């Protein structure tokens, strides 16, 4: 298997949630084999890719987190070569690396607000209501197909801080009315 490769980012930039592709497929190939990636990186939310899967990853207090069902145990390519996972937990569906060169990191949420916001791979910011340890309800139902490819992306509080990592969708006949995520407290405990 190859290294995970950053192929873009989801910009909250200044005002607009928009997606920025920074690498093509072809280049994704050679880079996964070497794990050496000089391509420029920015921001908190990365679009990450394997040979078969595209999903997201989020930097929180110096660690780049994503889902195990996306990354597995792979390294992630960097300018100084392939980066080995700092944290792994198959049961939680969680993996972490040292935040990449060029990135910014999110702050853990400390305000306890139930008003959350899920960022998707499509660069949509979707309102969510905290409804338990690892669960939050959507204000608007959406088909799964819409959310697919967004695991590893962040759930944010109204202050912009990180509340969790998107893990799975709670679906009924293919309609998602809630989301399952890894809470930051769970990250802090994994560390
Ligand atoms: C947008 C949709 C959603 C965020 C996404 N997550 C999934 O699709 C997960 C993967 C797998 C099935 N998923 C689901 O969401 C299902 C599904 C019916 C398919 C919607 N929903 C579901 O279980 O409801 C259950 C009540 C909750 C409680 C149980 C959830 C279990 C969570 C889970 N843990 C592990 C630990 C270790 C593993 O080793 C290989 C593998 C795992 N796989 C898991 O779920 C996503 O976008 N992925 S992705 O980006 O396209 C892909 C590129 C990476
Ligand atoms: Zn907060």
UniProtKB/TrEMBL annotation:
<feature type="binding site">
    <location>
        <position position="111"/>
    </location>
    <ligand>
        <name>Zn(2+) 1</name>
    </ligand>
</feature>
<feature type="binding site">
    <location>
        <position position="161"/>
    </location>
    <ligand>
        <name>Zn(2+) 1</name>
    </ligand>
</feature>
<feature type="binding site">
    <location>
        <position position="157"/>
    </location>
    <ligand>
        <name>Zn(2+) 2</name>
    </ligand>
</feature>
<keyword id="KW-0479">Metal-binding</keyword>
<keyword id="KW-0945">Host-virus interaction</keyword>
<keyword id="KW-0812">Transmembrane</keyword>
<protein>
    <submittedName>
        <fullName>NS3 protease</fullName>
    </submittedName>
</protein>
<dbReference type="GO" id="GO:0008236">
    <property type="term" value="F:serine-type peptidase activity"/>
</dbReference>
<dbReference type="GO" id="GO:0019028">
    <property type="term" value="C:viral capsid"/>
</dbReference>
<dbReference type="GO" id="GO:0003724">
    <property type="term" value="F:RNA helicase activity"/>
</dbReference>
<feature type="binding site">
    <location>
        <position position="109"/>
    </location>
    <ligand>
        <name>Zn(2+) 1</name>
    </ligand>
</feature>
<dbReference type="Pfam" id="PF02907">
    <property type="entry name" value="Peptidase_S29"/>
</dbReference>
<dbReference type="GO" id="GO:0055036">
    <property type="term" value="C:virion membrane"/>
</dbReference>
<keyword id="KW-1160">Virus entry into host cell</keyword>
<keyword id="KW-0325">Glycoprotein</keyword>
<feature type="binding site">
    <location>
        <position position="157"/>
    </location>
    <ligand>
        <name>Zn(2+) 1</name>
    </ligand>
</feature>
<dbReference type="GO" id="GO:0019062">
    <property type="term" value="P:virion attachment to host cell"/>
</dbReference>
<keyword id="KW-0167">Capsid protein</keyword>
<dbReference type="GO" id="GO:0019087">
    <property type="term" value="P:symbiont-mediated transformation of host cell"/>
</dbReference>
<dbReference type="GO" id="GO:0043657">
    <property type="term" value="C:host cell"/>
</dbReference>
<keyword id="KW-0472">Membrane</keyword>
<keyword id="KW-0645">Protease</keyword>
<dbReference type="InterPro" id="IPR009003">
    <property type="entry name" value="Peptidase_S1_PA"/>
</dbReference>
<dbReference type="GO" id="GO:0006508">
    <property type="term" value="P:proteolysis"/>
</dbReference>
<dbReference type="InterPro" id="IPR004109">
    <property type="entry name" value="HepC_NS3_protease"/>
</dbReference>
<keyword id="KW-0378">Hydrolase</keyword>
<keyword id="KW-0946">Virion</keyword>
<dbReference type="GO" id="GO:0033644">
    <property type="term" value="C:host cell membrane"/>
</dbReference>
<keyword id="KW-1161">Viral attachment to host cell</keyword>
<keyword id="KW-0862">Zinc</keyword>
<keyword id="KW-1043">Host membrane</keyword>
<dbReference type="GO" id="GO:0046872">
    <property type="term" value="F:metal ion binding"/>
</dbReference>
<feature type="domain" description="Peptidase S29">
    <location>
        <begin position="16"/>
        <end position="191"/>
    </location>
</feature>
<keyword id="KW-1133">Transmembrane helix</keyword>
<feature type="binding site">
    <location>
        <position position="111"/>
    </location>
    <ligand>
        <name>Zn(2+) 2</name>
    </ligand>
</feature>
<dbReference type="GO" id="GO:0046718">
    <property type="term" value="P:symbiont entry into host cell"/>
</dbReference>
């Amino acid at each position: 298997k190859g290294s995970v490769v950053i192929v873009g980012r989801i910009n909250l930039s200044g005002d607009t949630a928009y997606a920025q592709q920074t690498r093509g497929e072809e280049g994704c190939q050679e880079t996964s084999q070497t794990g050496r990636d000089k391509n420029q990186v920015e921001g908190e939310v990365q679009i990450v890719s394997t040979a078969t899967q595209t999903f997201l990853a989020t930097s929180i207090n110096g660690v780049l987190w994503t889902v195990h069902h996306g990354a597995g145990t792979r390294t992630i390519a960097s300018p100084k070569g392939p980066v080995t996972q700092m944290y792994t937990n198959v049961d939680k569906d969680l993996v972490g690396w040292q935040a990449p060169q060029g990135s910014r990191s999110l702050t853990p949420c400390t305000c306890g607000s139930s008003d959350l916001y899920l960022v998707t791979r499509h660069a949509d910011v979707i309102p969510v209501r905290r409804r338990g340890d690892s669960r939050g309800s959507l204000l608007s139902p959406r088909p799964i197909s819409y959310l697919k490819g967004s695991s590893g992306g962040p759930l944010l509080c109204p202050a912009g801080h990180a509340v969790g990592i998107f893990r799975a969708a709670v679906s009924t006949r293919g309609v998602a009315k809630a989301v399952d995520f890894i809470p930051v407290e769970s990250l802090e405990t994994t560390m």
